Amino acid sequence: RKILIIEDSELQRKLLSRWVSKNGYIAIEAESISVAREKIISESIDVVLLDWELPDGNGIDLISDILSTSPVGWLPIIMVTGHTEPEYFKIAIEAGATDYITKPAKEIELLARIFSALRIKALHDQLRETAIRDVMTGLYNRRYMEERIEQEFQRCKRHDSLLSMAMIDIDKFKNINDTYGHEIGDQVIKQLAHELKTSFRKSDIISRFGGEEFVILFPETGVVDATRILDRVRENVSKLEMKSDTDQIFHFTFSGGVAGGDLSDIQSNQELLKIADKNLYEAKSSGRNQIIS
Amino acid sequence: RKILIIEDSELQRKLLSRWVSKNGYIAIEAESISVAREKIISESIDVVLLDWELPDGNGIDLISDILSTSPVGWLPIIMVTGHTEPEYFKIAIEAGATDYITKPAKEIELLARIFSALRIKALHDQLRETAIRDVMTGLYNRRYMEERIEQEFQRCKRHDSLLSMAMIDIDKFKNINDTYGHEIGDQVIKQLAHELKTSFRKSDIISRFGGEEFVILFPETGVVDATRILDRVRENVSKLEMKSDTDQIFHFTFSGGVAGGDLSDIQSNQELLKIADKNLYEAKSSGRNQIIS
Ligand SMILES: Nc1nc2c(ncn2[C@@H]2O[C@@H]3COP(=O)(O)O[C@H]4[C@@H](O)[C@H](n5cnc6c(=O)[nH]c(N)nc65)O[C@@H]4COP(=O)(O)O[C@H]3[C@H]2O)c(=O)[nH]1
Ligand SMILES: Nc1nc2c(ncn2[C@@H]2O[C@@H]3COP(=O)(O)O[C@H]4[C@@H](O)[C@H](n5cnc6c(=O)[nH]c(N)nc65)O[C@@H]4COP(=O)(O)O[C@H]3[C@H]2O)c(=O)[nH]1
Ligand SMILES: Nc1nc2c(ncn2[C@@H]2O[C@@H]3COP(=O)(O)O[C@H]4[C@@H](O)[C@H](n5cnc6c(=O)[nH]c(N)nc65)O[C@@H]4COP(=O)(O)O[C@H]3[C@H]2O)c(=O)[nH]1
Ligand SMILES: Nc1nc2c(ncn2[C@@H]2O[C@@H]3COP(=O)(O)O[C@H]4[C@@H](O)[C@H](n5cnc6c(=O)[nH]c(N)nc65)O[C@@H]4COP(=O)(O)O[C@H]3[C@H]2O)c(=O)[nH]1
Ligand SMILES: [Mg+2]
Ligand SMILES: [Mg+2]
């Protein structure tokens, strides 16, 4: 629906700007990269037109500077460039552009690339607004568990059952990743998920919930038993010997809030979440490797 | 990893064929469109290069002739054309091409489009290799529901709960489809799913299970109650006025087996299925529009 144009030159920028808004689209102008970021966060930006040559960085650090800025952490970025060279295309795609236009842009080759992007965007939008299984961990994703909670809660609240929910978080993940590699970052998330899978009952509802976030539902289980068993894992994880990108041993831990059990005084399913969260906050806020309830 | 090239001319085709397999890829040659289809079905084809000008059709019927042929019903198709004209791009994208390449093809602008496609393919592949709801109906899919049943069963068997499972089937679907169109076929499946969604509890686990198959789980529900409510729907569906091909009113019905309730005598979760099926058999075998248990 909504396109953001980055171009240092006012005339080149306002030409694109018209081609866009002529075809029922919403033009959004950016002087250079400062302004562009204040829009990406500020508004619901579908597609990005990026002059390779901006008043700060040359294209190929400039690309991933918009990727990082995005809410979902990916926008479709069309290169509007005067670069021509074969290997400038293959650099731009390599660096995570969605498309490449060689200036001068023709109106009806552009509109076709904007369509081609809006297509490949709705794909990213599904994968992140629906119940998929996360390939990496083998656990379901988060909008799964959002749905699954409200089911499992409504069931347990109608049929006077115990329902206890955990909310887990890997301790200083940003750091593990930044220090050992996006590779080892991933390698840990896996090894944690593996412990979670092995530790409980097929009846229990494990799920990845965010970057390093996880969520467990323990139907028919009370807050203390939930804590007891979750804590027992937290320990075994603590004691787990991982290898660094040097083949150095290192350990990692998670913080946990658990919440629910009874449910008489919990009305919303969204309240049962608020609690698990407040409790994960304290868990971290108090030196991390520990469960709170 | 595996690219299929359609070009009438042997020399143009085997030039592309080398550019491809030079970059660690798998070239697959097609004389014209007959041969190409015998490959799409025959093998795991990632990406398609399509000469616009082939010995039978002009590009724009030729495109959707490959779309239909695909197992998943969509491949990324890159247009190799000598057409230049603005509105030939805008036709090709409109008609469901993934990209447009202007002959003569340059090695290193091609390889960039093939990469751009393999990316937008792996996105389609995620959404369909992990992704638990059926698109069409918005219900849980089958691979999920097989897993979900064994969970919900193991839960109910551990915690002495009632668990009743339905298995539904639209009556003489083949006929509805053959008479009114693959269009109206689809349109009914939807309308049934919608009734199923509206009729029960958030707690209940509805799922599309095959062409015209559906499955419901009624946790905490006994075989009779399951039957009563499932039968109440079967009725309202019966009374539903659908519109044909022609805007003719027509009605449709479903057959149902329900099974479980107690679970003391049922060991496998796969047995709880066998029963629902045997009962759907009788339901149909005895003049269809009816539940059996
Ligand atoms: N969601 C969930 N809750 C868990 C899990 N492990 C323990 N709990 C909770 O903790 C309680 C006590 O566990 P326990 O003392 O070993 O008490 C258990 C234990 O001795 C045994 N038990 C139950 N299920 C199993 C099982 O699958 N394997 C084994 N080896 N023993 C089991 O029977 C006792 C019955 O206690 P319960 O009524 O199950 O009550 C359980 C349950 O409320 C788990 O993996 N998932
Ligand atoms: N300490 C403790 N551990 C628990 C408890 N619940 C589950 N676990 C652990 O989690 C594993 C998975 O149990 P499950 O998936 O419910 O599936 C279980 C369950 O369906 C059945 N089973 C085993 N022991 C019991 C039991 O005491 N009661 C019941 N009702 N089923 C059991 O056998 C399966 C595998 O048994 P395990 O090899 O023992 O494997 C169990 C056990 O190692 C619990 O309450 N306490
Ligand atoms: N999974 C599932 N099971 C179902 C459903 N409808 C009925 N049952 C089962 O069959 C019984 C029939 O409920 P009812 O005769 O409609 O009589 C119901 C009805 O008058 C009322 N009631 C129950 N659930 C609801 C509800 O969700 N909404 C409203 N408005 N009333 C409800 O309270 C009575 C108590 O019924 P129960 O003790 O629950 O016992 C229910 C339960 O055993 C359903 O849609 N899904
Ligand atoms: N006769 C009958 N109809 C059923 C039954 N189960 C589901 N339905 C129908 O489908 C809806 C199911 O609501 P829910 O998801 O169970 O979730 C329930 C629950 O959260 C609450 N609710 C409504 N009635 C009851 C009830 O009797 N007991 C409890 N515990 N909650 C109820 O409101 C929701 C549905 O409110 P409704 O407007 O009535 O909407 C109900 C109702 O018209 C059933 O057993 N019997
Ligand atoms: Mg400029
Ligand atoms: Mg030719």
Author numbering:
A (entry chain A), B (entry chain B): 6 to 298
Paper text:
C-di-GMP is a near-ubiquitous bacterial second messenger responsible for the coordination of a variety of cellular processes and behaviour, including motility, biofilm formation, virulence and cell cycle progression. DGCs catalyse the condensation of two molecules of GTP to yield the twofold symmetric c-di-GMP product. Here, we show by biophysical and crystallographic analyses that DgcR is a constitutive dimer that changes coiled-coil geometry and domain arrangement upon pseudo-phosphorylation.
Each dimer shows a Rec stalk in native conformation and the two GGDEF domains have their active sites facing outwards. Dimeric c-di-GMP is cross-linking the domains by interacting with the R206xxD209 motif of one subunit and R163* from α0’ of the other subunit. Comparison with the PleD/c-di-GMP complex shows very similar binding, but with PleD providing an additional arginine (R390) to the Ip-site. The DgcR equivalent (R237) is too distant to interact, but this may happen with the Rec stalk in the activated conformation. Indeed, it has been noted earlier that among GGDEF sequences arginines are enriched at either position. The unique c-di-GMP stabilised GGDEF arrangement that differs drastically from DgcR’ again demonstrates the large flexibility provided by the inter-domain hinge.
